Amino acid sequence: IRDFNNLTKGLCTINSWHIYGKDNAVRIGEDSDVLVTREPYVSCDPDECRFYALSQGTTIRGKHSNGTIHDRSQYRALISWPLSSPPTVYNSRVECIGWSSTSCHDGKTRMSICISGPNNNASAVIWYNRRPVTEINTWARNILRTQESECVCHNGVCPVVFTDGSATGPAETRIYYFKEGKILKWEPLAGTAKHIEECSCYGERAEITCTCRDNWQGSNRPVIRIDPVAMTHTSQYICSPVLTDNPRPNDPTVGKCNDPYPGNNNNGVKGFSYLDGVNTWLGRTISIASRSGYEMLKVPNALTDDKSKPTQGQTIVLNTDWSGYSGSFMDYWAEGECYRACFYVELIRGRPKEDKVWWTSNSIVSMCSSTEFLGQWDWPDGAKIEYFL
Amino acid sequence: IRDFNNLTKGLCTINSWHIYGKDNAVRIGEDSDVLVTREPYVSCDPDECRFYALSQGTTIRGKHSNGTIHDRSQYRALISWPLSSPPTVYNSRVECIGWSSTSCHDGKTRMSICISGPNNNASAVIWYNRRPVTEINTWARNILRTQESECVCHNGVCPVVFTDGSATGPAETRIYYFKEGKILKWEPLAGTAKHIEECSCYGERAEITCTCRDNWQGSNRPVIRIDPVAMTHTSQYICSPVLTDNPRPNDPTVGKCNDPYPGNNNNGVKGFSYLDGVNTWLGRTISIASRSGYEMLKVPNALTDDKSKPTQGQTIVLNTDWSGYSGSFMDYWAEGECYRACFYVELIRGRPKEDKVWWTSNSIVSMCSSTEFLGQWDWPDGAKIEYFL
Amino acid sequence: IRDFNNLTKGLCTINSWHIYGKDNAVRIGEDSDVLVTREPYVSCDPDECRFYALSQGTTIRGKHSNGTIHDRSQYRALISWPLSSPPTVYNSRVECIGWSSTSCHDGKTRMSICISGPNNNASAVIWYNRRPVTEINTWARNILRTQESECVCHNGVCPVVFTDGSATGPAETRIYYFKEGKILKWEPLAGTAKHIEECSCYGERAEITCTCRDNWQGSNRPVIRIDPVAMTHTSQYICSPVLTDNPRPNDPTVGKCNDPYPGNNNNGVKGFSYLDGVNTWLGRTISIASRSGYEMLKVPNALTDDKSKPTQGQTIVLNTDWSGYSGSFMDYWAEGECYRACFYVELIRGRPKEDKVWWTSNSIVSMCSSTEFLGQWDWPDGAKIEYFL
Amino acid sequence: IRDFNNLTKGLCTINSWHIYGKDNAVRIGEDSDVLVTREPYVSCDPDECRFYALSQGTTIRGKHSNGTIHDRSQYRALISWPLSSPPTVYNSRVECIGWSSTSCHDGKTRMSICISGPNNNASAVIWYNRRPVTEINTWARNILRTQESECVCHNGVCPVVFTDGSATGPAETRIYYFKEGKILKWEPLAGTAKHIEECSCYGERAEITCTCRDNWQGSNRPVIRIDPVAMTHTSQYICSPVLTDNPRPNDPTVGKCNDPYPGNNNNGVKGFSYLDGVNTWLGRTISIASRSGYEMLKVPNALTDDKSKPTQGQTIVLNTDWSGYSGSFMDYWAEGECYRACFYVELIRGRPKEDKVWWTSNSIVSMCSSTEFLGQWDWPDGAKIEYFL
């Protein structure tokens, strides 16, 4: 009955962003049984789109919320839940157990991947059709880790980018090509990106583009472009001087295409872009110093043009509100002739920026592109920290 | 498999109203995780009827309920939930994000529309089959806004009435004709209605009738009648001297067919009527001054007869209980030979009438017509405000 | 696809009773969002069996639980929920609004009936396939009321017994014959039963037997036997001197077949029996004075033999625990060659017997027959009232 | 459409264990409506795998949690719920009522068995396709009891092991062979096992292997091997000197194949093994004295070789964390050419080891085998008891 999805369409023209989903999880969880989360994303099946994140295995009001700034424990799991509801104890479906994930539907069924273990002995389990199929042991014994947003499939082949090794020098990044949860091939990273974490990917016209985080050196973002038929890839950086990691230095006039733009070391944030010629939009935090604010900038030819500057933009979160990770997804099963770019922003609340509470959590806002030039609003998390004291 | 619904039936004869649904949301939410709402309605799919409303993105007992008198924020969404259950965190399905909505099923799938943004830069997103399809930017830069109750479709064409512009003088009302979430046509309001907000619509014999709110001048209600095949409409007022907005002056002996009946300016409430010759019933608040009580009056030829008075009635909510918005819907997929008129009343609790609590919310009661002459009960919200202090 | 169910089987031989379902609702609702209920029952669809009851439109821990001894309000509804779960805010499906009900599946879909209104102006609404179809106005203007347990259908015809009029003298009982929610016929009660309330019915070999409550005079129970093909009935009393209403006098040696067995006036409890020759079992409270304890007694030929005494029995609830209403149901869609008799007991907690709390609620236990002679346990509600203070 | 499952595959090669599911129930239930449980397990249907356990009919934070160390009451039920969610009031489906259970899917539908009653008069009810079909009365009048983990079917025949009689001397164990919930045959235990409780079973190549608990004498575990076609069985003990009950004496150099290995009397814990030649893995608690820690040991030929020692292992729960019962299950409906061994560990919290709280409950962790040699983590319950004081 169902066939594997093929990436046959190009991106729709992005003239602005419209609201798609928002869960208000922190506001609602002040007085309801909402799980503490972080590292959220969005992903569609052929008949539904859902929110996803890594639970911390406690509610926000629960006493076990104390300590949830920590990224890795035995109490995390990848959960999904209905679009724009909050992640509650009673509506959250566990996809797999662990503290680093990705997930994508191939048109027939869903693959989900969760990594668990101690830092020196982690392993991935690849689930397909809600059953475990393949396992991969750590190859560098230092926090095996993956995208924290959806993967993308083409004719059953779903590439996934993993890293294992240091966060503050060269590491061992691998691109795995899965089909029905089995490994067809893997390759080591090639090209000019010097460090890769937390790739945010999308597909169009039989090519998958991933915008990642160079935690080690780069305040420009590395880009991996994957051919899922040939099962090959390239890597470079976004050439534009509109720098989109965080923290970062101020924007220069000329960026770097094949090396990290320097100025900030050993830090970053997961983020994304859509790189499609003149139809190119970059997300970034507004602040250069912290995970505050969020904006989209139209930067024609950002990938290839080392002097490209914005020609249009849209504020998503004011710089007086907290943001966080951000990532790409699309509804590959929508009607019409083109794929509509979407993204989400994780709105982090609690530690370390708001340390009067003992927890860290987030809510989600997400937007998709419009071919209209729509008015803009800002979309904060909306919770009052003082209510939790 | 499924075909678009056609409005092939006339209304059943309304000889009284029977109880259809009631959620007791405020009573139950005193000690359960019920979302704060307002602007509720009811709408049917071919296999289920559901309650809908605009959440405020907090529970009633939650500390974020403080401030929920306010109509527009980034934390509102259109939600639906099973008939007569309350809107809870765990059972409420988000249809779209925003602070003004409508929704209707065309026989194949559902269209939902939500407007969001700041007052001077709002936009509608039209969702079809649970995906975003079309967007419309504000045309007058002043609170783009729509029905707050269900739309109606005929052979796939679902007209929707929007207003943008002042609430206290001429505004720019448009009737959009959607099919599969795409715009076939729109037209500016024509006819003699001088201001339109919050239309309540129903269909019968290939005609859609909408009873709306003239916020600017009129205490009689404007009526828009739409031909969804020709995609044309007319407008006038209910001619009857039984005035049905709120607040309003006392009832005269002769009303106005083609102009606002004066006496109250710059206010109103969403309401409804069924206008079908001798089979005409009007809803209204009992109080002329405030949103208290609710009654149905049988007013033969109310639309056309400027001296028409009641010949029968039914009390729905006593004048010592709070009411609120009211609106029309029908189950277009029921058995039998005629469409059974239904309506709901929003029972508003909290601010501004009950200001010992810091929140505003509501529950729902809803009734449908019977061809019997049934005994009447009154149907209050039923919550005790003192329990929330 | 689906056909109407026919009553083609006889009862299985009842040699003891096994546990079927129990919800522990009061225990669990001490610290979860469980609705206050009373007047529960059980009813099966072709693919699932569910618990049903009349909600009071509040949780047990909620402040609106104060006052829930009262039987009739605008905040009651017939709800159903999964077998042996408790009736919670989040899992309870409302079937219809009102304070007296019955419900049954005909093999194609379900009919549910709810009565609402003030005592002098009540009305029934008959829902079929989850939509309202027919309405019936009060005929005697004194608490129109029905079974409070499931009805039974045969080839689409579902008879239902209603009463309207005094509870303490002659009233007007009617048997309605519904098909697809429409009235085929009704008849006034005939035969020798002198007053009827709250009938508990079951079907076998194309005959429906209902055991009811004579509130006015009788401590023996009236029995109505209905032919759903001819749409006729008879009535009499259980002849046995094993008296099964409550309160009641002590058991005599000879009962009454065609008149109320006297000794207690103007009170009773809903109850049931299976009347099948030697395979006859009667339920009753153990106490003659109050709704405490519950037992089944095998009383061969109880219906017809005015000296019949027990030959076997089973204790269901000890006389040191509270009971309440009880009623019959069967799974008419089970495998095998005979219908397995089942029943439920309502375990009432709170007022008036336990008046340190301000509420009245209940839980459910239910049993079905076995052809084995099984060991017996007792099945109390299990909640500690002191925990609610 | 569906056919009965046949055990046509052998076990996959077990080279390590990967995380499969974990519910964090005690952590989450500190501030959400999680039921108190014990005696959990896991079982798959053709389209889903679920967690199961015996509820205690109260939440953990509820006042009725006081006293839940006790094993048998009228308020217990077998519940199931989605894999890795916690067992909550709102998501837990009751399978049947009682205080000892087993359940398995035959490829067409599920059989569930629950035993209830007082110790001297207990009875099993066998449910098939969610309806009661057969009942079995106590044969020895002393705590009729069964596996507390899943049964296994082959071509519709689902053997189940029961015991009735003393826990501290010879008892009466029976193997029942069910098909469609009916009894085809039963046999008394034969072979050399001298006492049997709480068998943990799995199937491969048309043979079912059960590893049980000799509560009376043995610190080695008894093994029952069942031929579900011939409906015959054998019994012996695991010959290995790697002793796997608890409490137990220290490991000797030579075990016992046909008699209990002595040293500890009248106690034990439910546990499991996979016995497949060199592909043999045994679970056990790390502590010899208490239910603390959990490890898997690869013990080639453990069943048959009375000097077999470990050649590989994996720690599952550190010896500074509490464990509990453990049991086997597999997904018999997975893809591929072999059945992947899985197990669960019950992580008991509260009494008697943690007696500052008044309750006993547990959470679940579960693992399945990998053909990789994966890094290991430990998987504690994760709750802080002090938060519950």
Ligand SMILES: *[C@@H]1O[C@H](CO)[C@@H](O[C@@H]2O[C@H](CO)[C@@H](O[C@@H]3O[C@H](CO[C@H]4O[C@H](CO[C@H]5O[C@H](CO)[C@@H](O)[C@H](O)[C@@H]5O)[C@@H](O)[C@H](O[C@H]5O[C@H](CO)[C@@H](O)[C@H](O)[C@@H]5O)[C@@H]4O)[C@@H](O)[C@H](O[C@H]4O[C@H](CO)[C@@H](O)[C@H](O)[C@@H]4O[C@H]4O[C@H](CO)[C@@H](O)[C@H](O)[C@@H]4O[C@H]4O[C@H](CO)[C@@H](O)[C@H](O)[C@@H]4O)[C@@H]3O)[C@H](O)[C@H]2NC(C)=O)[C@H](O)[C@H]1NC(C)=O
């Ligand atoms: C109702 O809603 C609508 C729809 O949302 C609202 O309209 C939106 O309004 C916003 C806000 O104004 C606009 O976003 C900004 O867009 C500009 C880009 O547009 C300007 O530039 C265009 C390019 O000009 C150049 O090239 C063209 C050739 O292609 C040439 O023609 C031109 O002369 C010049 O050489 C112009 O084309 C464009 O004009 C067009 O549009 C105008 C409407 O906007 C119209 O008036 C014109 O007639 C014409 O049609 C326009 O001039 C972005 O540049 C801008 O983003 C910068 O600024 C914000 C702060 O506001 C900052 O956060 C951004 O990061 C970015 O600035 C940083 O980075 C730059 C790049 O390196 C750097 O140069 C800056 O110094 C700055 O860097 C500093 O901050 C960063 C961030 O913290 C830090 O990292 C650095 O280190 C450093 O510290 C905004 O995105 C929307 O485009 C506009 N949308 C639409 C459709 O109109 C409307 O306002 C609402 N109505 C109401 C009443 O509220």
Ligand SMILES: *[C@@H]1O[C@H](CO)[C@@H](O[C@@H]2O[C@H](CO)[C@@H](O[C@@H]3O[C@H](CO[C@H]4O[C@H](CO[C@H]5O[C@H](CO)[C@@H](O)[C@H](O)[C@@H]5O)[C@@H](O)[C@H](O[C@H]5O[C@H](CO)[C@@H](O)[C@H](O)[C@@H]5O)[C@@H]4O)[C@@H](O)[C@H](O[C@H]4O[C@H](CO)[C@@H](O)[C@H](O)[C@@H]4O[C@H]4O[C@H](CO)[C@@H](O)[C@H](O)[C@@H]4O[C@H]4O[C@H](CO)[C@@H](O)[C@H](O)[C@@H]4O)[C@@H]3O)[C@H](O)[C@H]2NC(C)=O)[C@H](O)[C@H]1NC(C)=O
């Ligand atoms: C069990 O349940 C049943 C079923 O519900 C209960 O029966 C229901 O009882 C109620 C309450 O009585 C009825 O509702 C009222 O209905 C009347 C209309 O019916 C009267 O008028 C009919 C028309 O008479 C005129 O025309 C005919 C020709 O067509 C001519 O024949 C006649 O002589 C005259 O010229 C009569 O036909 C009708 O008689 C029939 O029915 C009688 C039963 O009701 C029966 O006894 C008769 O034999 C005959 O069969 C009857 O006389 C509505 O007028 C009325 O609503 C007005 O009053 C309420 C206050 O009660 C008010 O809230 C309404 O807004 C409305 O009055 C306001 O507006 C008017 C219009 O502008 C204005 O004129 C009024 O001054 C008033 O205005 C003021 O208040 C408003 C609102 O606050 C404010 O805006 C203004 O500014 C101003 O301040 C009720 O709807 C049901 O129809 C009736 N149903 C049935 C089927 O019987 C039964 O009672 C229950 N039993 C028990 C024991 O409780």
Ligand SMILES: *[C@@H]1O[C@H](CO)[C@@H](O[C@@H]2O[C@H](CO)[C@@H](O[C@@H]3O[C@H](CO[C@H]4O[C@H](CO[C@H]5O[C@H](CO)[C@@H](O)[C@H](O)[C@@H]5O)[C@@H](O)[C@H](O[C@H]5O[C@H](CO)[C@@H](O)[C@H](O)[C@@H]5O)[C@@H]4O)[C@@H](O)[C@H](O[C@H]4O[C@H](CO)[C@@H](O)[C@H](O)[C@@H]4O[C@H]4O[C@H](CO)[C@@H](O)[C@H](O)[C@@H]4O[C@H]4O[C@H](CO)[C@@H](O)[C@H](O)[C@@H]4O)[C@@H]3O)[C@H](O)[C@H]2NC(C)=O)[C@H](O)[C@H]1NC(C)=O
């Ligand atoms: C493990 O579980 C098993 C299975 O559950 C347990 O076994 C069950 O045990 C219970 C309790 O004993 C039994 O229930 C009682 O059953 C008797 C009926 O059986 C007796 O009578 C039979 C009829 O005898 C007469 O007729 C036959 C001819 O048909 C003739 O042969 C005979 O001589 C005589 O003329 C006997 O056949 C039967 O014997 C058989 O079974 C015996 C086992 O029980 C066995 O030992 C024998 O060999 C033989 O095989 C037996 O003698 C019911 O009468 C009884 O119910 C009455 O008593 C209870 C109080 O205990 C009361 O609550 C009931 O309401 C009822 O008594 C009231 O009503 C009567 C009727 O009007 C009245 O006469 C009484 O005075 C009394 O009235 C007072 O109280 C009521 C209520 O408050 C009030 O309204 C009145 O006004 C008044 O104040 C019990 O139901 C089960 O049948 C039995 N089941 C099985 C399969 O064995 C086993 O015990 C458990 N094991 C353990 C270790 O716990």
Ligand SMILES: *[C@@H]1O[C@H](CO)[C@@H](O[C@@H]2O[C@H](CO)[C@@H](O[C@@H]3O[C@H](CO[C@H]4O[C@H](CO[C@H]5O[C@H](CO)[C@@H](O)[C@H](O)[C@@H]5O)[C@@H](O)[C@H](O[C@H]5O[C@H](CO)[C@@H](O)[C@H](O)[C@@H]5O)[C@@H]4O)[C@@H](O)[C@H](O[C@H]4O[C@H](CO)[C@@H](O)[C@H](O)[C@@H]4O[C@H]4O[C@H](CO)[C@@H](O)[C@H](O)[C@@H]4O[C@H]4O[C@H](CO)[C@@H](O)[C@H](O)[C@@H]4O)[C@@H]3O)[C@H](O)[C@H]2NC(C)=O)[C@H](O)[C@H]1NC(C)=O
């Ligand atoms: C990243 O993750 C990986 C993967 O998990 C981690 O690697 C795992 O590391 C663990 C911990 O070391 C290993 O588990 C232990 O495995 C050993 C078995 O392996 C040893 O023995 C093998 C057999 O040797 C004998 O036979 C062979 C012939 O077949 C012969 O060649 C040999 O000379 C000898 O005669 C060796 O083959 C094996 O070597 C191989 O593997 C090595 C890696 O482990 C490698 O270095 C070698 O080159 C070679 O490749 C190895 O030597 C188990 O014996 C052991 O379990 C015992 O000990 C633990 C305590 O640690 C205890 O809890 C167990 O119960 C058990 O000991 C009890 O029972 C025994 C049996 O009766 C008894 O003899 C003991 O005295 C003891 O009894 C006491 O305690 C019990 C329990 O409380 C009580 O009941 C008794 O009464 C008494 O008080 C562990 O299971 C994994 O196998 C290994 N996995 C893999 C794939 O490598 C890696 O460490 C992680 N990395 C980091 C950085 O953390």
Ligand SMILES: *[C@@H]1O[C@H](CO)[C@@H](O[C@@H]2O[C@H](CO)[C@@H](O)[C@H](O)[C@H]2NC(C)=O)[C@H](O)[C@H]1NC(C)=O
């Ligand atoms: C995606 O492209 C693949 C490759 O062309 C399509 O695969 C074919 O699908 C049909 C079944 O629908 C098979 O009978 C062919 O044998 C397949 N060919 C190959 C080369 O695998 C697939 O159908 C396309 N997906 C969609 C949604 O059309």
Ligand SMILES: *[C@@H]1O[C@H](CO)[C@@H](O[C@@H]2O[C@H](CO)[C@@H](O)[C@H](O)[C@H]2NC(C)=O)[C@H](O)[C@H]1NC(C)=O
């Ligand atoms: C119950 O009995 C009725 C009456 O005999 C059966 O009704 C017939 O059903 C078939 C469809 O399955 C029709 O084509 C006939 O016309 C029906 N006859 C009548 C007289 O109504 C019904 O099928 C029986 N129900 C079951 C479950 O067999």
Ligand SMILES: [Ca+2]
């Ligand atoms: Ca960086």
Ligand SMILES: [Ca+2]
């Ligand atoms: Ca007005």
Ligand SMILES: [Ca+2]
């Ligand atoms: Ca709560």
Ligand SMILES: [Ca+2]
């Ligand atoms: Ca009586």
Ligand SMILES: [Ca+2]
């Ligand atoms: Ca033992």
